[PDB]
DNA sequence: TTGACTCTCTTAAGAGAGTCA
DNA sequence: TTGACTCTCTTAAGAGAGTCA
């Protein structure tokens, strides 16, 4: 198994490596009509990466080091979080986009949490606009709104009371 | 099946049908601190459903008919719905339950909307909680609230900033 | 040990279609 | 014609693991 100083150098070298990465300043809606700002770390769209990581698919990658000659990988954005416990009321933890921003590995952008967690991110209203999750989002989520519903509650006859 | 006649005879059908399904009063969260009462039309745990009704998951179920000596068939939710665009900005409409009660075939707790639209009324905080759906909610989201994240956002070096 | 590819899987909101009797 | 089962699929937020040089 690999030591808590191992798990340290791991983490470490993998925010010296994605330091490293183009930093992007995105303007962002925080909610309540106000703008902000964010800078994401943005992973390269094709090969090199950086070293440790390798593309798995469209928007998934992996950070990969070998330790006392044992291949070990991780998911490339649950790495900030390895010294922490891997699931919470029965559910797995994910990495968690604060930025909504995939290609960014800033771990100041990223949270660990259930994917139902993670989801519903994406239409919080935004930490200036009521955001009541007890770590706060970073900007408002990008599906929030009053949405494109093409049809509501209907009856032809009188069969039905809501 | 084609004819608009047809289609119409289909629904009339279905909500007949469905219209003497048991009748289940849920006590519901509006937001705001608010409470109140939904009357959802649940079909039968098990078979016999109703007339027309099959189920081909744990909870899904899909109506059929005979027309013009075929069968046609339908997701059993999808039914109030077939006289409507199939599809939305290049997305496909789902059938949506406003009360978040996947065996109520109440078509007053139904609209019909894009898959996104859809999942993020798990999270919304209600008709009386600000809820900003053009087609309103009829309860606050099962799943909204401050969440359970485990970790927040974090680095151990000076690489970063938000 | 490392890079750059390859493949399939999970979840929870939703789907279509085939086999029998 | 109708009923009661069977199977896999879609999406968009996330995953694990293999091959080859
Ligand atoms: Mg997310
Ligand atoms: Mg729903
Ligand atoms: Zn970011
Ligand atoms: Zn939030
Ligand atoms: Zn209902
Ligand atoms: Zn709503």
Redesign the pocket.
């Known amino acids: 198994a690999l030591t808590n100083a191992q798990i340290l150098a791991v983490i470490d070298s993998w925010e010296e490596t994605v330091g490293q990465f183009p930093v992007i300043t995105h303007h962002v809606p925080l909610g309540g009509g106000l703008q902000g700002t964010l800078h994401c770390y943005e992973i390269p769209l ?4 950086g ?7 469209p928007t ?1 990658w ?1 950070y ?3 330790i006392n ?1 044992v ?1 070990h ?3 490339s ?2 790495v900030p979080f390895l010294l922490e416990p891997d699931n919470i009321n029965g ?2 933890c ?4 604060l930025c909504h921003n ?1 290609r960014c590995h800033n771990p100041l952008h990223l949270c660990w949490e259930s ?2 967690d ?2 519903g991110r ?1 239409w919080c209203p935004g930490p200036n606009g009521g955001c009541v999750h007890a770590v706060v989002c970073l900007r408002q989520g ?2 929030y709104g009053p949405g494109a519903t093409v049809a509501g509650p209907q009856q032809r006859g009188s069969h039905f009371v809501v």
Chains 1, 2 share one sequence.
């Open positions: 094709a090969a090199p990466y070293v440790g990581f390798a593309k798995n698919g998934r992996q990969k080091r070998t000659q291949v990988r991780w998911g954005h649950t559910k797995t994910t990495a968690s986009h995939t994917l139902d993670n989801k994406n990008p599906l």
